Design a protein around this nucleic acid. Structure first.
Ligand SMILES: Nc1ncnc2c1ncn2[C@@H]1O[C@H](COP(=O)(O)OP(=O)(O)O)[C@@H](O)[C@H]1O
Ligand SMILES: Nc1ncnc2c1ncn2[C@@H]1O[C@H](COP(=O)(O)OP(=O)(O)O)[C@@H](O)[C@H]1O
Ligand code: BEF
Ligand code: BEF
Ligand SMILES: [Mg+2]
Ligand SMILES: [Mg+2]
Ligand SMILES: [Zn+2]
Ligand SMILES: [Zn+2]
Lengths: 364, 343, 249, 185, 370
DNA sequence: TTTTTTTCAGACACCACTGC
RNA sequence: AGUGGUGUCUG
């Protein structure tokens, strides 16, 4: 793609217009309507998940704010000021890594920069990434500035855990929540990126990568660059699947699936995988116990599946609907007994293997 | 003083402005909107200069006294604001609040913002001296049985058309989260200038933010609503609530339930309720719960609760939230297995 | 209060003498070291001489001054806090200083007031073995001349471990410093010397403190090889010696 | 070439660097705003220190051979070197690659530098008031009002001092919300 | 004997090229391909168990990036840059002991100096080792420079548990997981090392060393050094078996059989013999338990047995075919309870003896006479 | 009406006020 | 930089 392929797909591929953003349609539509209608809030807090675009959206909104063509939902192409945000630096757009500059003094300097006029753009736009890491006093200063901000100053805050922001900051910020990307959106964007990179790709590898991304597009892009690494400039399904298996840590769920199914060779293969990964064995037993307990609770009531396990919903459903509660009870008891007797074993590996052997031998 | 809901505040402000305004309650949104309305009305009657202070043990009271007594070169008609701390008017703060109550004047307007005041604990002195010529504004979060009509009123006053389905979806995702609920209505107005909100429109542009307290979880358990209780439990897990607080909050009502079910063989539940000093709204749901699969879940659930308590209080890895799911499912007419109960 | 009726050693010492004696050795103590016997200063009495020894296992500082009064040989370790606060209270050189050292506690009568402290139980190491026993290379320079060159070299020094390489050639000394940024400082100084080319890398702060302790005009350094220690003192006396053990980097 | 051939005494360079240092030394908003900008042009050295709001420039005469180059070097390290070197020592600094060599009689230093193209410069602007004034008049004008200025007030306009040019007089005004100081000369 | 050859195999045998690594091929292949194509990602993370080549491979990559020749997947040795990197104290390879730079002020000091150009090489390769020690603020501080750093700065992270890193960073950096090493690779490495060290070695000794290394080659090298110190600079079956404190599988299987075939007198005789050899009793119980678990695994599938104990393979098969799984489970549970109760037994010898006697009394196919 | 939490040990992170 | 406090998160 680029002048020698060192340039990372994650950073080279970053939206430059609102249309290049993958379907975070909620915030994009609301912000476009606000910009076009003139309804502007003092602060625009952005949040959501890692690698779903909150910093990209904030940068594009700053470009739209400070573009010389006017407050537009569509920043233009050349517009030298509107270009300075991407290539080079823009004077009036202040990008702060609030994680690097959490101190009230570092933010004090910029909040004293607030009252000075913008050089070129209309608005002294502030992009404060990882806003949740500012100290209590930095938050106090930011709030004090947010009470009465001048008409030439707007704040753009991005974070992953808004719960650490004070309610006083949240009341003055119109938070825009970004939802984790779907597998279809991630797969389609990866397909487009690889097609425009002239990279040979197999359709199934993209779905595997998207499923492995866990909803974050940047995870998909990093896994994609790594998959190109594992190979010679081609994203082959076999190479991608082998890489994913190497990176795989979902051993306990597969172990429960294979043990309930009574698949001894698959169980032993999964135990070999968990051994080669240097995975703790007591942790493996605890994960299997938790999975079985959750399966039982789902069998009692479908609402037992929270949003903490959205990656493994379907499998859980499949295991809860098809396995009677008696077998789950027996397996939970067997694994509890095995974990109780794990310390007194030839080694943890043999203890876990024997506990799973007992669970298989039950065949209930 | 004049005790007032946010509904009539405007009217009262049109009637006149008192010496001090006390904005109290647990709802950030209601307090914020009340403060904005008070400041706008004050500015209409010449109160131009504003100030802010956080009532803290480290605050500089001398600045407050100096600005309240002295006047400025411009905008003599001045207003002052104070954020009360989380606990409230601490015993080291009541005396200085009394001094402010002496250091006031008709030129200044005082705004008092903070959580609800335990009037049973704190009364008179500061309270009555303001009550002389002041306004109290109660801004508390509407509960679940009251939220739908509040959201309907807000939609009507913002010129939106909410049906019952969108109203209940909004009341589902945002509880104790009136600030984000109002922001959601504003975002939905931004998304569609039509102003007509249907089920899919709100359903797409909504997040399950919510905010619950362990009392909500215990009430959901007493009503025996599985999905409601599990949603509350997930919400307190994501919010980062300490599970031991949940344990104690459930334990109090669970031991009360055990006592009531044991004593109900000799005494009707009414006299038991009177004996234990339990309130009427609590009385209804506890009477509903007492005759809902009792005498088996009340010892099995105590067994599981003791298991969770000991597991939580010996190690440091916690992992008790699934056990709390077990409790949430046992007390909601969904019998569990002895395997997970005993352990 | 005073139950230490018997004292091991007694001094009627001028204030300036002990001021120099501590100031020439204080910076080489160990602060909160695991070797509890090194978290202090060793007062050693032999003949008419009192010596202060301080080391942290990376630099040794010994300073000796005559008293005139014959005293039995004795050793004592005064902790960091006690010696530092004694130094702080040691002002007004007009009044003499009385010192009363027992087997478990130390007392210092300064002016009119009295100071009391406890001892460190451990036994201080022998500093004679730390001192190089066969110094074959001897070089001389000016104290201020050498010190300013070290400071200029230390400007561009590794901020974590301030270390310079000192090279010695015929009537020439070289001080080279670098930091993780490869910013190189190089200072060349004219000395009087006779020997062989040798490189030795040692800390800068320790050498600068040694030079600041010797408020003199001529400095003699005694070196054996690239791996052993360097003994620095003044050329106008032999009452104060310092041992800088180099780095192996 | 790359070497911004530079050679000056210390007596004519200590005070200009002391003036140009200004706010530098602490943690900067951008990593380059801790480096003095050194420029050579027309037999003159320009020292520049920027804070993204303030711009201090000092001019030093060059009476020795020189080359037109420019680069940004850490302020504290360069100043410590400059004052560390002895009295009357003719500093000779040149450049190569990304490192500049400082030299004095029997001493050498090497410093890591950043390009001058990256260092910020405040954009040229048109001026409406060209004003010339003696030193003591400005001293009294500032000193008679500096006390009345605001102290980190929430009102930005209260902070700072007002300069008014009216007819034949210049006026300094200061306010903190309760005091007013006016000095017109 | 020899001179001051103190340089231990653990460090003297640190790999110096990508051809000297023992087979982290999923990592080595990716690094070689990316370095050949130039897709040099600005930050990535070698994560694995102990002693499986994370730090070593990171150093090899630094060599590959900073070689005087063109950027190559096979670093050279005549090049000055790689020589400095191998000897340490390289200008640009900034090893960061992250467990000593956990604080956020240290990370900020690191990030301030990032934009400075590399001095002598072409990359200022930051090698942050044991990254999981960084505090949360340090991780968030690294986030932005991990998104896109200057064109010359590369981040090489290495940690044992990649799950303790915030998942934002797991997004920013590539992930390479180095798995543990099979017995064959470890034993072949020990063979090669002892060939190059002129130390006579025996097969069974190296097989036992590779079995007791537990999939990591640094444990294998420390164990090999300990075995060489146990002998007179010679690796032998007796020396390694005495060092590891284990038993030859024949004796353990003889005792297990005497238990199974109800030959209680043989059980007593082999217990006395093991007492003569001065072997730990808990070691005896653990070895019998391991053999019983191996029999059970053979009962699950024939492929359970590894080549390391091939000597007893036949007998294993026989004892697997003779004994149905319920008796194997009963024996394993009895010996497990015996080992669990061993610390409270009056003597360890009689604790193991009564464990065996209980396993013999509760014998279903041949109980002790009543 | 209010009603809500164990613990010992350790690791950071920020922010006075001092002290040069 | 030394000292003291707040507070948050890890077992
Ligand atoms: N909506 C999106 N559209 C396109 N790329 C995205 C989107 N969200 C994330 N990415 C990818 O992830 C990379 C980092 O995105 P970023 O917006 O910084 O995530 P964050 O919300 O965690 O700050 C971007 O360079 C881009 O490649
Ligand atoms: N893949 C490997 N090939 C050869 N030797 C290895 C390998 N992995 C580990 N070792 C041995 O372990 C020693 C230290 O390995 P190291 O790379 O530090 O492991 P770590 O990943 O834990 O830092 C090396 O000197 C080498 O002898
Ligand atoms: F940059 Be994101 F919040 F991971
Ligand atoms: F870096 Be390894 F874990 F020894
Ligand atoms: Mg971000
Ligand atoms: Mg390592
Ligand atoms: Zn534009
Ligand atoms: Zn090379």
């Amino acid at each position: 793609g680029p002048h020698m392929s060192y340039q990372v797909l994650a950073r080279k591929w970053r939206p430059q217009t609102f249309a290049d953003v993958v379907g975070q349609e909620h915030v994009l539509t609301a912000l476009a309507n606000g910009l076009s209608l003139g309804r502007i809030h003092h602060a625009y807090l952005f949040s959501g998940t890692r690698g779903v675009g909150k910093t990209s959206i904030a940068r594009l909104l700053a470009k739209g704010l400070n573009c010389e063509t006017g407050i537009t939902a569509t920043p233009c192409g050349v517009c030298d000021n509107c270009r300075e945000i991407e290539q080079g630096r823009f004077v009036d757009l202040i990008e702060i890594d609030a994680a690097s500059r959490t101190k009230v003094e570092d933010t004090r300097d910029l909040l004293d920069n607030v009252q000075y006029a913008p050089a070129r753009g209309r608005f002294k736009v502030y992009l404060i990434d990882e806003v949740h890491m500012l100290s209590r006093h930095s938050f106090n200063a930011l709030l004090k500035t947010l009470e009465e901000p001048p008409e030439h100053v707007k704040f753009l805050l991005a974070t992953t855990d808004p719960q650490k922001l004070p309610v006083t900051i949240l009341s003055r910020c119109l938070q825009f929540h970004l939802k984790a990307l779907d597998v279809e959106q991630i797969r389609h964007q990866l397909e487009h990126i690889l097609n425009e990179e002239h990279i040979a790709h197999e359709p199934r590898a993209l779905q595997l990568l998207a499923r492995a991304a866990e909803g974050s597009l940047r995870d998909a892009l990093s896994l994609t660059d790594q998959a190109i690494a594992s190979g010679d400039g081609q994203v082959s399904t076999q190479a991608v699947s082998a890489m994913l298996g190497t990176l795989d840590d979902d051993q306990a769920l597969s172990l429960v699936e294979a043990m309930v199914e009574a698949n001894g060779e698959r169980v032993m293969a999964l135990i070999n995988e968990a051994a080669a990964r240097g995975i703790e064995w007591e942790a493996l037993l605890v994960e299997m116990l938790g999975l079985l307990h959750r399966i039982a609770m789902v069998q009692l009531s479908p609402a037992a599946l929270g949003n903490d396990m959205a990656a493994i919903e379907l499998r859980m459903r499949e295991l809860a609907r098809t396995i009677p509660p008696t077998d789950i009870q027996l397996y939970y008891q067997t694994l509890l007994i095995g974990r109780k007797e794990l310390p007194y074993a030839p080694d943890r590996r043999m203890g876990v293997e024997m506990t799973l052997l007992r669970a298989l031998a039950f065949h209930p | 003083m004049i005790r007032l809901y946010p509904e009539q505040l405007r009217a009262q402000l049109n009637e006149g402005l008192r010496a001090a305004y006390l904005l109290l309650g647990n709802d950030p949104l209601l307090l914020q909107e009340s403060q904005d309305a008070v400041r706008q009305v004050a500015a209409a009657q010449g109160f131009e200069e504003h100030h802010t202070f956080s009532i803290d043990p480290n605050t500089d009271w001398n600045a407050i006294f100096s600005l309240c007594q002295a006047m400025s070169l411009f905008a003599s008609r001045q207003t002052l604001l104070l954020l009360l701390p989380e606990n409230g008017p601490n015993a080291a703060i009541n005396e200085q609040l009394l001094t402010l109550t002496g250091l006031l004047h008709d030129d200044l307007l005082l705004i008092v913002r903070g959580n609800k005041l335990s009037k049973a604990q704190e009364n008179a002195a500061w309270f009555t001296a303001l009550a002389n010529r002041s306004v109290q504004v109660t801004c508390q979060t509407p509960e679940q049985a009251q939220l739908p009509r509040w959201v309907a009123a807000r939609a009507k006053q913002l010129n939106l058309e909410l049906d019952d389905a969108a109203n209940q979806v909004l009341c589902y995702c945002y509880e104790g989260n009136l600030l984000a609920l109002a922001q959601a209505l504003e975002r939905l107005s931004l998304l569609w200038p039509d102003g007509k909100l249907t089920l899919p429109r709100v359903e797409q542009a909504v997040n399950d933010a919510a905010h619950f307290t362990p009392f909500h979880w215990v009430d959901a358990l007493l009503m025996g609503k599985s999905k409601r209780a599990l949603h509350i439990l997930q919400q307190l897990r994501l919010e980062g609530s300490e599970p031991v607080i949940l344990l104690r909050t459930l334990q109090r009502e669970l031991l009360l339930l055990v006592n009531l079910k044991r004593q109900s063989a000799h005494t009707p539940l009414r006299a038991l309720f009177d004996k234990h000093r339990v309130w009427q709204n609590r009385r209804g749901m506890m009477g509903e719960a007492l005759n809902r699969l009792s005498q088996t879940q009340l010892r099995q659930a105590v067994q599981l609760l003791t298991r969770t308590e000991l597991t939580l209080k010996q190690d440091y890895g916690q992992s008790v939230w699934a056990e709390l799911e077990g409790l949430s499912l046992l007390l909601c007419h969904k019998p569990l297995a002895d395997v997970f109960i005993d352990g | 209060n005073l139950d230490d009726w018997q004292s091991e050693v007694e001094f009627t010492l001028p204030q300036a003498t002990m001021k120099r004696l501590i100031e020439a050795t204080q910076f080489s103590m160990a602060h909160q070291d695991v070797r509890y016997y090194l978290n202090g200063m060793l007062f050693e009495t032999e003949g008419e001489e009192l010596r202060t020894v301080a080391t942290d296992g990376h630099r040794l500082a010994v300073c000796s001054m005559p008293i005139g009064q014959s005293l039995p040989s004795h050793s004592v370790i005064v902790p960091r806090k006690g010696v530092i606060e004694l130094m702080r209270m040691l002002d007004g050189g007009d009044n003499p200083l009385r010192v009363q050292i027992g087997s478990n506690n130390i007392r210092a009568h300064v002016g009119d007031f009295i100071f009391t402290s406890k001892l460190v139980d451990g036994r201080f190491p022998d500093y004679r073995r730390v001192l190089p026993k066969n110094p074959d290379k001897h070089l001389e320079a000016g104290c201020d001349l050498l010190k300013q060159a070290f400071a200029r070299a230390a400007i561009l020094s590794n901020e974590k471990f301030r270390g310079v390489r000192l090279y010695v050639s015929e009537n020439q000394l070289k001080i080279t410093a670098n930091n993780p940024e490869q910013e190189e400082a190089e200072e060349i100084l004219d000395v009087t010397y006779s020997g062989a080319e040798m490189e030795i890398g040692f800390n800068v702060s320790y050498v600068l403190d040694v030079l600041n302790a010797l408020k003199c005009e001529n400095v003699r350094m005694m070196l054996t090889d690239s791996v052993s220690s360097v003994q620095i003192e003044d050329a106008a006396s032999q009452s104060a010696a310092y041992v800088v053990m180099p780095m192996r980097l | 070439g790359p070497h911004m051939k530079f050679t000056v005494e210390r007596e004519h360079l200590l005070k200009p660097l002391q003036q140009v240092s200004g706010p530098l030394g602490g943690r900067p908003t951008l990593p380059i705003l801790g480096n003095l900008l050194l420029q050579v042009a027309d037999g003159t050295l320009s020292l520049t220190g920027t804070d993204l709001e303030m711009e201090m420039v000092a001019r030093v005469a060059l009476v020795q051979p020189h080359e037109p180059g420019a680069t940004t070097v850490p302020a504290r390290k360069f100043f410590d070197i400059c004052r560390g070197l002895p009295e009357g020592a003719e500093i000779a600094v040149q450049l190569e690659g990304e490192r500049m060599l400082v030299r004095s009689g029997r001493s050498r230093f090497s410093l890591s530098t950043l390009p001058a193209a990256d260092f910020p410069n405040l954009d040229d602007w048109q001026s409406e008031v060209e004003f010339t004034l003696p030193q003591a008049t400005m001293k009294r004008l500032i000193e008679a009002t500096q006390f009345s200025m605001a102290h980190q007030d929430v009102r930005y306009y209260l902070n700072g001092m007002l300069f008014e040019t009216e007819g034949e007089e210049l006026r300094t005004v200061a306010t903190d919300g309760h005091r007013l100081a006016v000095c017109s000369m």
